[PDB]
Amino acid sequence: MPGTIKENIIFGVSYDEYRYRSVIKA
């Protein structure tokens, strides 16, 4: 599903926000 970190802006390069900035932070 993911890639080997190399030109993969797709919604799969972990944007430290998709599911990291909207779960346990109000």
State which residues form the domain around 18.
1-26
C-alpha of 15 from chain center: 3
Classify residue 24 by its DSSP letter: S
For tokens 């779960």, what's the residue? 23
CB within 8 Å of 5: residues ≥ 6 apart: 13
Spatial distance between the Cα atoms of 11 and 19, rounded to a whole number of angstroms: 11
Helix (H, G, I), strand (E, B) or coil at 13: coil
Q: Which two tokens stand for residue 26?
A: 């109000």
Deposited experimental method: NMR
How many domains in the chain? 1
For tokens 């909207």, what's the residue? 22
